[PDB]
């Protein structure tokens, strides 16, 4: 089963961002290298579309850091509370 379109657009926008940030430092041989980069990006998207992988479910990746931090805080609070309860 092919993956959902959300991760596909995520990957394509990261590719666009990295292409832009590597082109920002380019001075010579401008248009042909970016045309080749776009061609290989499209080829990679096609290859990912044709590939198969067992499905997985999640949400957008823009909220990873906040969720991880709150999970760490919850883990620490639960651990200290459990330690206090066990000592009691």
């Amino acid at each position: 089963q092919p993956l959902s379109k959300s991760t596909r657009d995520h990957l394509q926008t990261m590719m666009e961002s990295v292409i832009m940030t590597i082109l920002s430092n380019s001075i010579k041989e401008k248009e042909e290298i970016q045309y080749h980069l776009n061609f290989l990006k499209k080829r990679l998207l096609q290859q990912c579309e044709t590939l198969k992988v067992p499905p997985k479910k999640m949400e957008d990746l823009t909220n990873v850091s906040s969720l991880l931090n709150m999970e760490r805080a919850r883990d620490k609070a639960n651990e200290e509370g459990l330690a206090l309860l066990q000592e009691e």
């Binding site: 990261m14 990746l61 991880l68 999970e71 459990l82």
Partner: protein, 63 residues
């Protein structure tokens, strides 16, 4: 976990065509960049799931 070997061998199946030094350097740079991004994303996903299930287990235990 299965698309990773494919994307890994994409490197040397692309190396056989390009020959310019600057293009090769750029290819290697963004290849290692996207590889690091993929690895960190997968690790973050796995540890996020583990932290979620661990938090559920601990809250059940304390309650």
């Amino acid at each position: 976990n299965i698309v990773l070997p494919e994307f890994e061998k994409t490197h040397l199946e692309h190396q056989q065509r390009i020959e310019s030094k600057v293009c090769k350097a750029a290819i290697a740079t963004f290849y290692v960049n996207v590889k690091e991004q993929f690895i960190k994303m997968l690790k973050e996903s796995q540890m996020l799931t583990n932290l979620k299930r661990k938090n559920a287990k601990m809250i059940s235990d304390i309650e």
